[PDB]
Amino acid sequence: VVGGTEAQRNSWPSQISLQYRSGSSWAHTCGGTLIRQNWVMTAAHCVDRELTFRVVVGEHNLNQNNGTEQYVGVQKIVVHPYWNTDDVAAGYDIALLRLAQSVTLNSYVQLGVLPRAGTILANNSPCYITGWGLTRTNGQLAQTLQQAYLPTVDYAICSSSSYWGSTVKNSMVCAGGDGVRSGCQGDSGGPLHCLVNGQYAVHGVTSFVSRLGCNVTRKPTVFTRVSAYISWINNVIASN
Numbered sequence: 001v002v003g004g005t006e007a008q009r010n011s012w013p014s015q016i017s018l019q020y021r022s023g024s025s026w027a028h029t030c031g032g033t034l035i036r037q038n039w040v041m042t043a044a045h046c047v048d049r050e051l052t053f054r055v056v057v058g059e060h061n062l063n064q065n066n067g068t069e070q071y072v073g074v075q076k077i078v079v080h081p082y083w084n085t086d087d088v089a090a091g092y093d094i095a096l097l098r099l100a101q102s103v104t105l106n107s108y109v110q111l112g113v114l115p116r117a118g119t120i121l122a123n124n125s126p127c128y129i130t131g132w133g134l135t136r137t138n139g140q141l142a143q144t145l146q147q148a149y150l151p152t153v154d155y156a157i158c159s160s161s162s163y164w165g166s167t168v169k170n171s172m173v174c175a176g177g178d179g180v181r182s183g184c185q186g187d188s189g190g191p192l193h194c195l196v197n198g199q200y201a202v203h204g205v206t207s208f209v210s211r212l213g214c215n216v217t218r219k220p221t222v223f224t225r226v227s228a229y230i231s232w233i234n235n236v237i238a239s240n
């Protein structure tokens with residue numbers, strides 16, 4: 001997250017860290033949202049490589065023991081069947097991870113509330129991106145979880161020629177684009193939390209930023225629109 005602030009450690013209890021095995025240790029690669037005690041929602045592009053993955057829930061600082069973490073292996077990976085690694089702009093950048101063990105819920109570990117199917121936010125709706133992604137374009141991951149206020153940019157504006165044009169689809173949510181705050185590499189997969197009727201709900205799964213950089217004016221961070229995939233998510237959890 002570029003231009004973020006450090007989140008309080010119990011603000012976003014559904015945020016998870018998706019990590020891969022690297023030698024004798026583990027490395028953060030993406031975020032995710034805990035949606036059941038044994039299921040995580042993340043981006044399909046985060047699980048494209050043939051790596052060994054684990055999920056960390058109750059995480060705040062990646063480089064320090066917080067005394068709240070729970071570590072669980074990924075038992076099954078279900079990518080949307082229409083995802084294509086050669087075309088992130090086509091959409092379908094979503095995947096569900098079945099955890100080997102069910103995690104225990106507490107003030108640091110909670111299920112993410114998902115919007116009702118079909119819900120579209122009005123332009124400029126209040127949202128926060130959260131993650132441990134780079135803190136600057138071509139920078140380094142954050143140690144502590146970060147958050148940034150990214151108001152939505154509706155489809156009409158976001159798919160206009162000066163923004164993302166035809167690259168953005170109506171199955172996506174755009175947010176931000178101010179040139180200062182944005183998602184960045186390593187935030188992908190994680191949540192876009194938006195305040196609706198008093199309650200924050202996870203409306204987006206971080207998917208991409210401009211190839212020019214993370215915080216680029218008129219290139220808002222782009223997310224998979226969760227509310228387009230409610231039936232798909234329910235169908236996967238029910239058949240697995």
Ligand SMILES: *C(=O)[C@@H](CC)[C@@H](CNS(=O)(=O)c1ccc(C)cc1)C(=O)O
Nearest residue numbers: 029183184185186187188206207208209
């Ligand atoms: C996600 O973080 C996204 C920017 C918000 C990235 C794409 N995903 S990533 O950094 O996790 C990634 C990059 C390259 C590879 C080979 C794998 C994963 C983006 O650049 O849009």
Ligand SMILES: [Ca+2]
Nearest residue numbers: 061064065066
């Ligand atoms: Ca930690």
